[PDB]
Amino acid sequence: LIEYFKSQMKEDPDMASAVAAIRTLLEFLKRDKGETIQGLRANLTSAIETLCGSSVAVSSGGELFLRFISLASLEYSDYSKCKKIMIERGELFLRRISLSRNKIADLCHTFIKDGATILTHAYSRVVLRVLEAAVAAKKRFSVYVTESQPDLSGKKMAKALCHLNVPVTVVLDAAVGYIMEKADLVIVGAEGVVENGGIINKIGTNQMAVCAKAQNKPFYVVAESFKFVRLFPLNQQDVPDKFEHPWVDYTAPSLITLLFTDLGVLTPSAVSDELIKLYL
Amino acid sequence: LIEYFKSQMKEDPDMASAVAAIRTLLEFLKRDKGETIQGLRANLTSAIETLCGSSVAVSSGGELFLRFISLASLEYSDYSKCKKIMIERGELFLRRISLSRNKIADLCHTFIKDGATILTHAYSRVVLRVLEAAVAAKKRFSVYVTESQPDLSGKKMAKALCHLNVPVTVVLDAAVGYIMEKADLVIVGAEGVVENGGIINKIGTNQMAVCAKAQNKPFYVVAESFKFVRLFPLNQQDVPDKFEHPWVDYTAPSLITLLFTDLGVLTPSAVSDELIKLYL
Amino acid sequence: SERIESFVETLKRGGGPRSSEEMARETLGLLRQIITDHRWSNAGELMELIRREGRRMTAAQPSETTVGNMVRRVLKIIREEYGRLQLQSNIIEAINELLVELEGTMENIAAQALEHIHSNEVIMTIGFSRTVEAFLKEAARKRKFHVIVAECAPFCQGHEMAVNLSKAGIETTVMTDAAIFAVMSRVNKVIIGTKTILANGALRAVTGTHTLALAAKHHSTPLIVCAPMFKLSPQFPNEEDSFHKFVAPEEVLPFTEGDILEKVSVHCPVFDYVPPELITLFISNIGGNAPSYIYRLMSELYHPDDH
Numbered sequence A, B: 001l002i003e004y005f006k007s008q009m010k011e012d013p014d015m016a017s018a019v020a021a022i023r024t025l026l027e028f029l030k031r032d033k034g035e036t037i038q039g040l041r042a043n044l045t046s047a048i049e050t051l052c053g054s055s056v057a058v059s060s061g062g063e064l065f066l067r068f069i070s071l072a073s074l075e076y077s078d079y080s081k082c083k084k085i086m087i088e089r090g091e092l093f094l095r096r097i098s099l100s101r102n103k104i105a106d107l108c109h110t111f112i113k114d115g116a117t118i119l120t121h122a123y124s125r126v127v128l129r130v131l132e133a134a135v136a137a138k139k140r141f142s143v144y145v146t147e148s149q150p151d152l153s154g155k156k157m158a159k160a161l162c163h164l165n166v167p168v169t170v171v172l173d174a175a176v177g178y179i180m181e182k183a184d185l186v187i188v189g190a191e192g193v194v195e196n197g198g199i200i201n202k203i204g205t206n207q208m209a210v211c212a213k214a215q216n217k218p219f220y221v222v223a224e225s226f227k228f229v230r231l232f233p234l235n236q237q238d239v240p241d242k243f244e245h246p247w248v249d250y251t252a253p254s255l256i257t258l259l260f261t262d263l264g265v266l267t268p269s270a271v272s273d274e275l276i277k278l279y280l
Numbered sequence C: 001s002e003r004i005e006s007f008v009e010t011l012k013r014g015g016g017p018r019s020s021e022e023m024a025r026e027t028l029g030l031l032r033q034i035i036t037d038h039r040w041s042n043a044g045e046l047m048e049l050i051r052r053e054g055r056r057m058t059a060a061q062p063s064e065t066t067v068g069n070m071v072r073r074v075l076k077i078i079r080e081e082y083g084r085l086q087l088q089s090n091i092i093e094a095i096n097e098l099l100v101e102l103e104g105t106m107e108n109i110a111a112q113a114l115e116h117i118h119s120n121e122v123i124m125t126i127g128f129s130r131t132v133e134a135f136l137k138e139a140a141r142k143r144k145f146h147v148i149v150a151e152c153a154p155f156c157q158g159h160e161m162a163v164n165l166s167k168a169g170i171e172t173t174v175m176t177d178a179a180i181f182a183v184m185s186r187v188n189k190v191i192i193g194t195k196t197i198l199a200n201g202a203l204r205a206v207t208g209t210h211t212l213a214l215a216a217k218h219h220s221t222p223l224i225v226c227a228p229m230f231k232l233s234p235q236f237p238n239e240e241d242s243f244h245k246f247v248a249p250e251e252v253l254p255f256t257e258g259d260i261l262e263k264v265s266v267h268c269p270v271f272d273y274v275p276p277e278l279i280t281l282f283i284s285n286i287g288g289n290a291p292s293y294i295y296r297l298m299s300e301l302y303h304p305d306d307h
């Protein structure tokens, strides 16, 4: 299954690392014995076995499709339960997750300010999807990026963004202060979002966003319908074991302004209604 | 003279180059013709000729010894004026500038908090002088550093500090946010200080110090008696021509707490009294 | 004679003369006497005697900063006296002039009161200080404001002042210390008296001054700390935990309720720490200087022998 999932994401220039695991557990959920309750626990072990590797979103999809498959215990049956109806229901839940980014872009596109200088500290997929549609129908804008030191992955956005044909500069990640006097509408994507509407992304995010709400410029975040976990931190150094070697940092929801999701546009204090609407 | 100054700083593991320039203009001020007023203007041209190279402190010493020599117009004489008394007065002034760091350390030493975790973002001389005396008579403390990306010069402080035998960690310069939850008493040295008590140092300083007065930990700065310029900015992108290529940044004096100087301990709103006491 | 030794014991046992010109009149007394008839050498053997008797005097309870303060000022008068320099006549005369100048602090620091408090203006103070009560009493020839006084600091010595005010002046109400944030949403112009004020601009005061000043720079109301001269202490806040007075925890927990007092730790601090990032004016004996200027005022008085 490990070679199967790695095989699924090997031939993929898009799709979620998380979506790859979702299809992996879909097919490896299809071809297995034990059409019963406790057999799902074996998949739970596979949920640990898939979780071998980092990348918090994988565990998010784990509990996500774990709950999606797990909801088939209601509407009870025997040996041919409606999780088999969630093979195509699920399949269309997977195409539902597949068509997700387009709605996020079609909602998001309007907030670009026609003479704006959008700042970003990443290499995100859906940021480039929405920003590509943004130039592909609308006005012009500069983009500033900085490069995340243990990947230099920002330069991938420099290259691919230069293929999108818009004027890019990219300064190093130490002088973001010097950047923000000449910038507006800071946009970043995010790996995961915790239950109070906070983001976890690369290991420089708070070093900006603390400086975002000092020079009073806004700070948006944008993610699909798979970053909602039940986790709840309250301080730095209270993140789980997911990291000169840290990998992810935390940004408190007293800083994140209006965020975007596949459910629609959203405020940073309504995420709790979504997840508490789901989990109970 | 260029080879003379470069020769002076080549054989020097201490006595900073701004300082070396001072001795360079001392000797090359000694062996020249024109014992008159306008001949000093030739040295002013040499003040431009020394200023060929960056490093704001050089211009600071330029106007500094330019004013020190320039004060010999008062107590007027002819052809044997008391700037020749400022050859040994000056030598005294150069040894006065030479013995400067020791007083800064002997004042500064006490503020270490005996179980403190001092953070620093540099490779400074006098920081290591004072911190070396700090371990050399007193308690223990950790030190965290990050490395300035276009020099990696922090690692020089990692090495030399490890020769001082105290426990050092050093994380990269993107995750300072993650550092500051576990830190107190942020100490940094500084290239130059502007007329309202603000610092200019390496190109990451404000990216921290904006985050210093959010988690309410203090922020000290420390420099000798040669960083006082008459310059006065008011915003970023209003620094002079002294810089992926910026080299120095700015930190507003609403953030710098009590600073240290060869005149004594000092508050960030009394520098103006010193320079206005001097320049007029 | 060695009656100073009695004095050296007098500060040792405690029993304060209120800080109302007893500490300063006495220190001026003993310094006048040791200045009067002692050993004599020209080259500051008097000054060396001042250093010796000084450090012996400062070996008292390290909170009475007025003692060492007026000690150091006597030294600066010695240094300027020699600077212009029968020296005993000039030194004792100038010390007499400093005594007479010290003799009028609580009046002139209370004249400048009509220019601040206006009609119908809910002032607010914590603790009780002679200068703040005298200062507020000269603003009784203006309108009827309120006064909110906190009953803090067990032992809570706060009230005597609410008596000494209410029966002569404005409608004061007395609040417990633990209600200083339902109030202070409906107030302006806070005042606090100062036990001693530091070089950087800090107020070392009664044990609830912080948590109050924080409310001031939360609702953005200005707080004056009316304090005379001679209480500008050098030595920026380096020495730690000798900054206070820890008193017997009998005052906070009774010796009754046995066995609980086996394993439980009681704390009692008398002072606290107000940093210069929250004070918004000093009303003083000669001027009206701001916080961030206080620095040079200290250099106006002393000499670099500040140890």
Ligand SMILES: O=C(COc1ccc(Cl)cc1)N[C@H]1CC[C@H](NC(=O)COc2ccc(Cl)cc2)CC1
Pocket (backbone or CB within 6 Å): C120, C121, C122, C146, C148, C173, C183, C186
């Ligand atoms: O009388 C009181 C007493 O209130 C408290 C006293 C103590 C405590 Cl703990 C709690 C409340 N409060 C206020 C009531 C308004 C008055 N001022 C006025 O009537 C004037 O109103 C103004 C002032 C200025 C302008 Cl520009 C407009 C209206 C000040 C006193």
